[PDB]
Amino acid sequence: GWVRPDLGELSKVTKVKTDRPLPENPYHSRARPEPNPEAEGDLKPAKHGSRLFFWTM
């Protein structure tokens, strides 16, 4: 009683019932380094301007 599969049936993506636990870290990755402080705040004018040599602005 074997019915031969039709065209494009064995290439389907199918689902599997498994009790094997999902590997939580399959890549064996380390801990990612902490990001940069990403500072945030409100802009204010430069203190005494450019402060380049004799320029007052």
């Binding site: 940069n36 402080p37 500072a39 203190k47 005494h48 402060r51």
Partner: protein, 70 residues
């Protein structure tokens, strides 16, 4: 008469000098601080400055790759 019509009192120049000296002293200390901050950021790389690009991780493709072991 000459003092009354051409010149001002000593307090004016005194306090103007005080303000000028404050401005210049703060500028000097800010210049030293900025030089030190630049040195620290260039050495350690943890600051907003001297941030050099690395590969964007959004380019990586996370899909089955025709072979189980990547």
């Amino acid at each position: 008469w000459i003092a009354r019509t051409f010149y001002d009192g000593p307090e004016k120049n005194y306090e103007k000098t005080m303000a000028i000296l404050q401005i210049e002293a703060e500028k000097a200390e800010l210049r030293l601080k900025e030089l030190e901050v630049r040195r620290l950021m260039r050495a350690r790389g943890d600051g907003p400055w001297y941030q050099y690009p690395t590969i964007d991780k959004a380019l990586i493709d996370h899909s089955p790759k025709t072979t189980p072991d990547n």
